[PDB]
Amino acid sequence: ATLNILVRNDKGRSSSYEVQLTQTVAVLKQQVCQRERVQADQFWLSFEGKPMDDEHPLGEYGLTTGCTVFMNLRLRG
Amino acid sequence: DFLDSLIWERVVDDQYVTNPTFCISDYFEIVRQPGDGNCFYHSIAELFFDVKTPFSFRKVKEHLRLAADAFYDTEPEAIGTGVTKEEYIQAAMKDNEWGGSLEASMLSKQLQITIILWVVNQTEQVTAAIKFGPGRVSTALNLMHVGRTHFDALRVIN
Protein backbone atom coordinates (compact mmCIF):
# COMPACT_ATOMS: atom_id res chain seq x y z
CA ALA A 1 0.00 0.00 0.00
CA THR A 2 2.01 2.93 -1.31
CA LEU A 3 1.23 6.48 -0.18
CA ASN A 4 1.44 9.88 -1.88
CA ILE A 5 2.78 12.67 0.31
CA LEU A 6 3.99 16.20 -0.39
CA VAL A 7 7.44 17.48 0.58
CA ARG A 8 7.88 21.26 0.81
CA ASN A 9 11.43 22.02 -0.33
CA ASP A 10 13.87 24.77 0.69
CA LYS A 11 12.29 27.17 -1.83
CA GLY A 12 8.85 26.45 -0.37
CA ARG A 13 7.78 24.39 -3.39
CA SER A 14 5.82 21.20 -2.73
CA SER A 15 5.90 18.11 -4.94
CA SER A 16 4.60 14.56 -4.58
CA TYR A 17 6.59 11.59 -3.30
CA GLU A 18 5.40 7.97 -3.42
CA VAL A 19 6.29 6.37 -0.06
CA GLN A 20 5.50 3.40 2.13
CA LEU A 21 4.64 4.01 5.77
CA THR A 22 7.04 1.16 6.64
CA GLN A 23 10.06 2.84 5.04
CA THR A 24 12.44 4.85 7.19
CA VAL A 25 12.86 8.62 7.13
CA ALA A 26 16.38 8.05 5.79
CA VAL A 27 14.86 6.44 2.68
CA LEU A 28 12.57 9.44 2.20
CA LYS A 29 15.60 11.71 2.61
CA GLN A 30 17.30 9.71 -0.17
CA GLN A 31 14.33 10.40 -2.44
CA VAL A 32 14.50 14.11 -1.60
CA CYS A 33 18.24 14.13 -2.36
CA GLN A 34 17.54 12.64 -5.80
CA ARG A 35 14.92 15.20 -6.78
CA GLU A 36 16.43 18.30 -5.13
CA ARG A 37 20.05 17.35 -5.97
CA VAL A 38 21.23 17.77 -2.38
CA GLN A 39 23.15 15.72 0.16
CA ALA A 40 21.40 14.02 3.07
CA ASP A 41 23.45 15.85 5.71
CA GLN A 42 22.31 19.27 4.40
CA PHE A 43 18.72 19.06 5.69
CA TRP A 44 16.31 17.44 8.13
CA LEU A 45 12.60 16.70 7.76
CA SER A 46 9.71 17.67 10.03
CA PHE A 47 6.00 16.87 10.19
CA GLU A 48 3.33 18.56 12.32
CA GLY A 49 5.94 20.26 14.46
CA LYS A 50 8.05 17.16 15.12
CA PRO A 51 11.51 16.39 13.69
CA MET A 52 11.67 13.07 11.86
CA ASP A 53 14.43 10.68 12.93
CA ASP A 54 16.33 8.94 10.12
CA GLU A 55 16.05 5.43 11.57
CA HIS A 56 12.28 5.54 12.28
CA PRO A 57 9.56 4.42 9.85
CA LEU A 58 7.39 7.17 8.37
CA GLY A 59 4.32 5.55 9.93
CA GLU A 60 5.51 6.60 13.39
CA TYR A 61 4.78 10.24 12.48
CA GLY A 62 1.24 9.57 11.25
CA LEU A 63 1.80 10.48 7.60
CA THR A 64 -1.31 10.16 5.43
CA THR A 65 -2.10 10.75 1.77
CA GLY A 66 -1.82 14.43 0.92
CA CYS A 67 0.11 15.47 4.03
CA THR A 68 3.11 17.81 3.74
CA VAL A 69 6.56 17.05 5.15
CA PHE A 70 8.84 20.09 5.58
CA MET A 71 12.41 20.13 4.28
CA ASN A 72 14.54 22.18 6.68
CA LEU A 73 18.04 23.33 5.73
CA ARG A 74 21.11 22.88 7.90
CA LEU A 75 22.85 26.22 7.35
CA ARG A 76 26.57 26.65 8.03
CA GLY A 77 28.86 29.51 7.02
CA ASP B 1 5.20 47.21 6.65
CA PHE B 2 6.45 44.53 4.26
CA LEU B 3 8.92 42.65 6.48
CA ASP B 4 6.56 42.42 9.44
CA SER B 5 3.69 41.20 7.23
CA LEU B 6 5.37 38.00 6.02
CA ILE B 7 3.59 34.71 6.69
CA TRP B 8 5.73 32.35 8.78
CA GLU B 9 5.26 28.57 8.69
CA ARG B 10 5.97 26.93 12.04
CA VAL B 11 8.55 24.16 11.67
CA VAL B 12 9.15 22.96 15.24
CA ASP B 13 8.80 24.69 18.62
CA ASP B 14 9.84 28.30 17.96
CA GLN B 15 11.41 27.73 14.53
CA TYR B 16 9.60 29.17 11.50
CA VAL B 17 10.22 29.35 7.75
CA THR B 18 9.06 31.69 5.01
CA ASN B 19 9.88 31.86 1.30
CA PRO B 20 9.32 35.37 -0.07
CA THR B 21 11.04 36.66 -3.19
CA PHE B 22 12.53 40.14 -2.91
CA CYS B 23 15.93 41.75 -3.22
CA ILE B 24 17.62 41.86 0.18
CA SER B 25 18.95 45.38 -0.49
CA ASP B 26 15.48 46.91 -0.85
CA TYR B 27 14.73 46.39 2.85
CA PHE B 28 18.08 45.78 4.60
CA GLU B 29 21.48 47.40 4.81
CA ILE B 30 24.30 44.85 4.56
CA VAL B 31 26.95 45.05 7.30
CA ARG B 32 29.77 42.99 5.84
CA GLN B 33 31.81 40.57 7.93
CA PRO B 34 35.20 38.91 7.40
CA GLY B 35 35.59 35.57 5.69
CA ASP B 36 37.71 34.09 8.47
CA GLY B 37 35.41 31.19 9.41
CA ASN B 38 33.82 33.18 12.27
CA CYS B 39 31.43 35.27 10.13
CA PHE B 40 28.34 33.81 11.82
CA TYR B 41 29.56 34.89 15.25
CA HIS B 42 30.86 38.20 13.85
CA SER B 43 27.40 38.87 12.42
CA ILE B 44 25.65 38.08 15.71
CA ALA B 45 28.16 40.24 17.60
CA GLU B 46 27.64 43.15 15.19
CA LEU B 47 23.93 43.24 16.03
CA PHE B 48 23.83 41.97 19.63
CA PHE B 49 26.57 44.11 21.21
CA ASP B 50 26.87 47.88 21.10
CA VAL B 51 30.65 47.86 20.50
CA LYS B 52 32.15 45.91 17.58
CA THR B 53 35.77 44.75 17.68
CA PRO B 54 37.51 42.07 15.57
CA PHE B 55 37.26 39.78 18.62
CA SER B 56 33.66 40.43 19.75
CA PHE B 57 32.68 37.12 18.11
CA ARG B 58 34.41 35.30 20.97
CA LYS B 59 31.85 36.64 23.46
CA VAL B 60 29.11 35.10 21.31
CA LYS B 61 30.90 31.75 21.35
CA GLU B 62 31.09 31.95 25.15
CA HIS B 63 27.29 32.19 25.20
CA LEU B 64 27.18 29.29 22.74
CA ARG B 65 28.99 27.03 25.22
CA LEU B 66 26.35 27.85 27.82
CA ALA B 67 23.58 27.45 25.24
CA ALA B 68 24.83 24.08 23.99
CA ASP B 69 25.08 22.66 27.50
CA ALA B 70 21.44 23.61 28.18
CA PHE B 71 19.77 22.94 24.81
CA TYR B 72 21.88 20.74 22.49
CA ASP B 73 20.37 17.42 23.57
CA THR B 74 16.89 18.68 22.61
CA GLU B 75 17.81 20.46 19.35
CA PRO B 76 15.70 19.28 16.38
CA GLU B 77 18.58 19.85 13.96
CA ALA B 78 20.82 17.59 16.08
CA ILE B 79 18.75 14.39 15.70
CA GLY B 80 20.19 11.46 13.79
CA THR B 81 23.68 12.96 14.04
CA GLY B 82 25.21 10.65 16.65
CA VAL B 83 27.36 13.48 18.06
CA THR B 84 27.07 14.04 21.80
CA LYS B 85 26.92 17.42 23.54
CA GLU B 86 30.58 17.26 24.58
CA GLU B 87 31.81 16.31 21.10
CA TYR B 88 29.88 19.19 19.54
CA ILE B 89 30.95 21.85 22.06
CA GLN B 90 34.72 21.49 21.85
CA ALA B 91 34.50 21.09 18.06
CA ALA B 92 32.29 24.17 17.70
CA MET B 93 34.62 26.16 19.98
CA LYS B 94 37.68 25.79 17.74
CA ASP B 95 38.75 29.02 16.08
CA ASN B 96 37.45 29.60 12.54
CA GLU B 97 34.80 26.88 13.01
CA TRP B 98 31.68 27.63 10.99
CA GLY B 99 28.31 28.14 12.65
CA GLY B 100 24.75 28.56 11.50
CA SER B 101 21.18 27.41 12.06
CA LEU B 102 21.97 24.96 14.88
CA GLU B 103 23.89 27.68 16.73
CA ALA B 104 21.18 30.27 15.98
CA SER B 105 18.52 27.97 17.46
CA MET B 106 20.40 27.51 20.74
CA LEU B 107 21.57 31.13 21.01
CA SER B 108 18.01 32.32 20.42
CA LYS B 109 16.95 30.38 23.51
CA GLN B 110 20.02 31.25 25.61
CA LEU B 111 19.93 34.99 24.92
CA GLN B 112 16.10 35.24 24.71
CA ILE B 113 16.36 36.94 21.31
CA THR B 114 14.92 36.23 17.88
CA ILE B 115 17.43 35.44 15.12
CA ILE B 116 16.53 35.26 11.41
CA LEU B 117 18.76 33.73 8.74
CA TRP B 118 17.95 35.07 5.25
CA VAL B 119 19.06 32.73 2.46
CA VAL B 120 20.13 34.72 -0.58
CA ASN B 121 21.14 33.61 -4.07
CA GLN B 122 23.79 35.28 -6.25
CA THR B 123 21.21 37.80 -7.54
CA GLU B 124 20.83 38.96 -3.90
CA GLN B 125 17.24 37.67 -4.08
CA VAL B 126 15.79 36.02 -0.97
CA THR B 127 14.83 32.38 -1.49
CA ALA B 128 14.10 31.42 2.13
CA ALA B 129 14.32 32.72 5.68
CA ILE B 130 14.48 30.74 8.92
CA LYS B 131 13.35 32.50 12.10
CA PHE B 132 14.49 31.21 15.50
CA GLY B 133 12.31 32.66 18.24
CA PRO B 134 8.88 34.27 18.48
CA GLY B 135 9.75 37.89 17.67
CA ARG B 136 9.03 39.93 14.57
CA VAL B 137 11.50 40.83 11.83
CA SER B 138 11.94 44.48 12.82
CA THR B 139 13.10 43.49 16.32
CA ALA B 140 15.09 40.38 15.35
CA LEU B 141 18.78 39.91 14.67
CA ASN B 142 18.80 39.53 10.88
CA LEU B 143 21.65 37.71 9.15
CA MET B 144 22.29 37.16 5.44
CA HIS B 145 23.52 33.73 4.30
CA VAL B 146 25.25 34.11 0.91
CA GLY B 147 26.80 31.45 -1.31
CA ARG B 148 25.81 28.81 1.26
CA THR B 149 29.21 29.61 2.83
CA HIS B 150 29.11 33.08 4.41
CA PHE B 151 27.13 35.24 6.84
CA ASP B 152 26.84 39.03 6.98
CA ALA B 153 24.73 41.14 9.30
CA LEU B 154 21.62 43.03 8.21
CA ARG B 155 19.97 46.16 9.56
CA VAL B 156 16.37 46.97 8.69
CA ILE B 157 16.15 50.16 6.64
CA ASN B 158 14.05 52.39 8.96
Author numbering:
A (entry chain B): 80 to 156
B (entry chain A): 2 to 159
How do the authors describe this structure?
This OTU reverses posttranslational modifications by ubiquitin (Ub) and interferon (IFN) stimulated gene product 15 (ISG15). Sheep ISG15 was derivatized into a suicide inhibitor with propargylamine and incubated with KUPEV and GANV OTUs to form covalent complexes that could be used for X-ray crystallography. This yielded an atomic resolution structure of KUPEV OTU bound to the C-terminal domain of sheep ISG15 (C-sheep ISG15) solved to 2.06 Å and a low-resolution structure of GANV OTU bound to full length sheep ISG15 to 3.15 Å.
Examination of the high resolution KUPEV and low resolution GANV OTU-sheep ISG15 structures reveals them to possess the familiar overall mode of OTU-substrate binding, in which the OTU binds to the C-terminal domain of ISG15 by a mix of hydrophobic and electrostatic interactions. One of the most noteworthy interactions is that of sheep ISG15 D89 forming water-mediated interactions with both KUPEV OTU T128 and R149. Considering the selectivity pocket in KUPEV is lined by hydrophobic residues V18, V120, A129, and I131, the adoption of a more solvent-exposed confirmation of the charged aspartate in sheep ISG15 is understandable.
